[PDB]
Design a protein around this ligand. Sequence first.
Ligand SMILES: [Ca+2]
Ligand SMILES: [Zn+2]
Lengths: 80, 320, 343, 80
Amino acid sequence: ELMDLYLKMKPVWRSSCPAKECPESLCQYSFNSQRFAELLSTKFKYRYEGKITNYFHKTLAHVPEIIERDGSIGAWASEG
Amino acid sequence: YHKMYRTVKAITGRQIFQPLHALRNAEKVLLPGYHPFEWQPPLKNVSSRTDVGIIDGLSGLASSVDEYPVDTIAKRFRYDSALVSALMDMEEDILEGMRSQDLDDYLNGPFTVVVKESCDGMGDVSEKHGSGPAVPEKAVRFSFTVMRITIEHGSQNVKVFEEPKPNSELCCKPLCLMLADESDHETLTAILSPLIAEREAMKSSELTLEMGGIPRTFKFIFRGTGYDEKLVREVEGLEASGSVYICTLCDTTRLEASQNLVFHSITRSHAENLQRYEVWRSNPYHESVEELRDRVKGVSAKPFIETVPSIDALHCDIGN
Amino acid sequence: MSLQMVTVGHNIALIQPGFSLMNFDGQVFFFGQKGWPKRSCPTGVFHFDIKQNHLKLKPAIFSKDSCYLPPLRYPATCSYKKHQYIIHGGKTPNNELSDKIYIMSVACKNNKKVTFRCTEKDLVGDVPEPRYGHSIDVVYSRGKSMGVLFGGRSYMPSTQRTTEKWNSVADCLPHVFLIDFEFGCATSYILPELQDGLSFHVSIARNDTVYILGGHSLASNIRPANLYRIRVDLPLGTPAVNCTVLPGGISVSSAILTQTNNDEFVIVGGYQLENQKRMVCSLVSLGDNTIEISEMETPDWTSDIKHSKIWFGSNMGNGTIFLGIPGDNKQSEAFYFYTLRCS
Amino acid sequence: AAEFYKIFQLEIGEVYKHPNASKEERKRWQATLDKHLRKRMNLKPIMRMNGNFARKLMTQETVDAVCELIPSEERHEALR
DNA sequence: TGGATCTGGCCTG
DNA sequence: CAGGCCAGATCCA
Ligand SMILES: [Ca+2]
Ligand SMILES: [Zn+2]
């Protein structure tokens, strides 16, 4: 289930135009983030209690606001 | 290419491929320093000459025995001239885009151009022998792309050109290549200060360019989204890469970030970080080191490159 | 004339040209690190302790009301006399010049630990422009203590500055400024006996006179072998300034001064030309009204010093000079450090 | 060429009069040899010796730049 | 016995 | 594999 949650999350910030490529995954990103966070808190308490990593925090917190402000996330990457 | 041209000459008899000198003559048109551009108002601290090509990236840094030692090689382009060349390389593209949405062809409305500047260092670049300073075996590149260009028509706006492959290697146009270290800060600031000065000067200026028989004006909006987290921290004040304060977008500490993990907001900016550095340096509230750090929320440096608070998808995927 | 090799611990990657050594009641401290301060030492000052030719750099904490200052890369060194220490101007790690002035003092001290006090002071009057490489000394004329500033190197004005020559530097104006520390006042005195600027020169203080010798003029790209003696008195009204040209001066830039004995100063190292090395040392037997510069025996330099291009240092205070040699490529630890005993 | 490099590294320290040497002494000899080699003939230091390094180091200017760091003259003439 | 002092874990490259 | 920071185990006057 953690694996499925990550695969449901990834298109949102990897799409070059999420509003026209993955609206169904976009509209439930908040619910997926909540579910992922509660899973990490409960089932994986042995690693994520009082210590979490930068990229997990970023993915679970800041993505929708960045999408709203910019329009796309993957377009402005450093992969180019 | 010379070998291929010579053998095709010898066999076929005609001249199918053009000579190298002809190629080099046609080369100069695309390179910066060939088109005329006028600013209004003129850029502050930027010369009005329109034939600047490849200039030294050190910007005439003092390299005598009496001052700070320099161990870098840097060749860079003036930002405005590079933008002019990038815009002129897509003259036909802009004309086609303006034709596509049933607009005019001689319309000279103020274009709004957004540019994504990306800077990332490299490792294991082999230093060469030969005359020069004790150059470290690290290379830092600075580059920019033209994402979208819009014109103001009527009450709303309409897009003319949008890059279909924003992450391709064909759009990351280089700007400034220095063979210096990313960790070293003094040399990085010394070499990258002129580009930041030019960008700040152009933030509030109008570029005039003769676009296919009709003069049109330009505007520039810059977003620094193409930096990795380590360089973002090393530039915009934040210390190290792993500390008590984690995100470069929110003032949330590690423990409560782990505890909450779902509810956060974006607060950090560049002017705010400048104010926080001023607070740290002046110590207005007469506090100890720990309480001053808590008040300043991890800003212990002077930011000097404006980085837009975004997330880097590639390195995010790598870390996850 | 004793030269000894010194080893540095796990902070050797943090000593850069332009540092200064601060002496407080026999304790020597450090300033001018690389990059913005880290969490190992957020203040920026360091405990410069050498025991058995080994150097350890323990952090030093500021006071509660202290102001945390950026690491100045080429400041101006002064020694006030209640024993405080004043630094003026220099380069920040982001390479912009500052015209601010700071005051150093020891607020409290317990066993092997210290707390410093930094004070922000704003100058009024003819504010000197931000600059680096200059020298500032204090004089005691008729019971009144007052500081004197001389020109150095500074960036071009904010109007004739261009991005292509953004890092070009030119010597400051020949003007000699006077700073009153207790009031923070500055009055500019233009004196015809001075025609060209000086940079990276040494300054020697006495009761009411300062002896500046050497210096580099970038405008003419020459180093004069001259000597200016300035005498300042403090009447009830406006101060009067007079400088006299004296013979016997040497042509040295970026030299290092030490105070070995009373009325006895020594000069070690520097650069005569761009590729020339100021290999011999000059003794400055300071006097009441006579100046005599004589050459002592040349210390037995090592091959690394004899075949390097760059060395830089500061004053340890107890008749010792701490000079360094660029070690090798980063690829021992990028720097080799030496200590030098002055009698 | 590697053997000659080690011979120069030893000779710039005068091992014939100092039969016992420390690892710090050998490291300093290596560092000064690399620095002066760069300064004079402009070869960067390398850890695995190439053939271009061999061809450039097999010159008379090489023994010149080495002997301007050897105080004695008998070593100068022997190396030459 | 209460801070120094290594020391390994963790974060990004 | 370098580099920096933090929680933890010794430790020594
Ligand atoms: Ca990279
Ligand atoms: Zn965050």
